[PDB]
Amino acid sequence: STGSATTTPIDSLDDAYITPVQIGTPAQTLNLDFDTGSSDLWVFSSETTASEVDGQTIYTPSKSTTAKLLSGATWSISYGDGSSSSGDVYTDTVSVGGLTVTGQAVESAKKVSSSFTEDSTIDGLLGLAFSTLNTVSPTQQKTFFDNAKASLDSPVFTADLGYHAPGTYNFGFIDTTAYTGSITYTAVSTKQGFWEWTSTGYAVGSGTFKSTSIDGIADTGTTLLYLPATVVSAYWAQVSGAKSSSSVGGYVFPCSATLPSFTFGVGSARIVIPGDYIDFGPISTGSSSCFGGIQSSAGIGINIFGDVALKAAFVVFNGATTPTLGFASK
Numbered sequence: 001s002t003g004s005a006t007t008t009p010i011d012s013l014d015d016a017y018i019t020p021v022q023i024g025t026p027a028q029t030l031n032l033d034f035d036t037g038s039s040d041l042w043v044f045s046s047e048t049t050a051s052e053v054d055g056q057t058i059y060t061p062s063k064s065t066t067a068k069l070l071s072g073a074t075w076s077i078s079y080g081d082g083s084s085s086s087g088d089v090y091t092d093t094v095s096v097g098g099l100t101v102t103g104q105a106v107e108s109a110k111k112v113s114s115s116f117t118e119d120s121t122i123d124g125l126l127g128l129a130f131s132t133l134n135t136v137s138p139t140q141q142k143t144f145f146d147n148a149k150a151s152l153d154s155p156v157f158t159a160d161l162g163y164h165a166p167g168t169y170n171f172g173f174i175d176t177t178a179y180t181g182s183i184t185y186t187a188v189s190t191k192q193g194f195w196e197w198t199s200t201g202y203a204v205g206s207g208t209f210k211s212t213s214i215d216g217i218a219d220t221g222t223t224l225l226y227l228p229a230t231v232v233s234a235y236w237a238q239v240s241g242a243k244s245s246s247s248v249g250g251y252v253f254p255c256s257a258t259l260p261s262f263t264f265g266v267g268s269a270r271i272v273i274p275g276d277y278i279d280f281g282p283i284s285t286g287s288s289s290c291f292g293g294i295q296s297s298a299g300i301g302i303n304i305f306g307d308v309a310l311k312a313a314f315v316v317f318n319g320a321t322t323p324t325l326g327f328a329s330k
Ligand SMILES: C[C@H](O)c1ccc([N+](=O)[O-])cc1
Pocket: 016, 033, 034, 035, 037, 038, 079, 080, 081, 083, 115, 116, 119, 125, 220, 221, 222
C-alpha cells in the first residue's frame, strides 16, 4: 500500500503545515500537523475543555462506530517550545492520503496549552518520530508510520514541504518526479527517539564551505533552523544591522535586507536554503525589524533542522531495519 496527502502552510510565513487526516467511521477529517520530532497522534476532541477550543475541528469518538476506549491509557506531552497537551486514548481507524491503519491510538485531548487554543488551523498532531517517544501510559503506543510500515510497498515516508505553497507527504514510495539529481542518504541515530543525523558542514551565501560535524534532528514540527551559536553568528554577521535581541528572543534583522542563502552538507552533497526562506517577517505587525529563520540552539540542547531547512529539500525518512535519512534538491 501507499498513501499521498497534500500538506498546506497554515499562514503566510509557513509557520507550520497541516495535512488532512480521516479518523473514525464515518470519517471525521481533521487537519493535523505532521511532526517528525514527536510520536503522539493527538487531536482536539469532544473531551477537550470547552474554553480551550477556539475554531478547531474536533474528533468525537462517540460518533465513530470503530472507536474504542483504550482503557486506563493516558497521555501527556511537553514540546520544545513549552507547549503541552494531555488526555485519554481511543483506538480507531486512521487514513492519510488513502493509506488506512486500523487500531491506531488516537490520543484525545482533555487539556491543551494556550498556543494550541490560539491556533485555530491545527486540529492536532501526527507524530512521525520513533515510537519510543510516545507518551501513552501505561502501555506505549505506535505511531501511524510504525503501524502502517509492514503494509507499505517500501518502509518509508517522504516530506516535500513547500515554500509559501502546498507540498506533499507520501507513505510507502519515493516519487522520483518530485526531486532533481540524486538522493543522498545519511546515517540516523535512534538513541534519543528522533531522526537524528550529522550534517557535514555549512556555507553562508557564496562563502567557502566549512567542513564540521553538526548533529541534529530532522523535525517537520519545528518552524525554524536551530544551529550552534558559532554557525548562527557567522550567518548573521553577513547581514548589515542583524543582531541577537534578548527582548525579542533571537536574531533580528532589518526588513530592508536581502538575506544570503545558507547551505548545509549531507555527506558530500549540499542543500541550499535560499535567503528568502530565512525571512520570517516583522517581529510585530508593521515593524521594520524582521525575525530570522536561523537561530541559535545553545538554549535547547539539540540542533534542529526544522521546516526552514527541510522545505529546501525532498526528504526521505527511511524506516527500514537500519533507519536512514535521504536528502535531494528539488
Ligand atoms: C501550537 C504550536 O505552534 C506548536 C507546538 C509544537 C508543535 N510541534 O512541535 O510540532 C506544533 C505546533
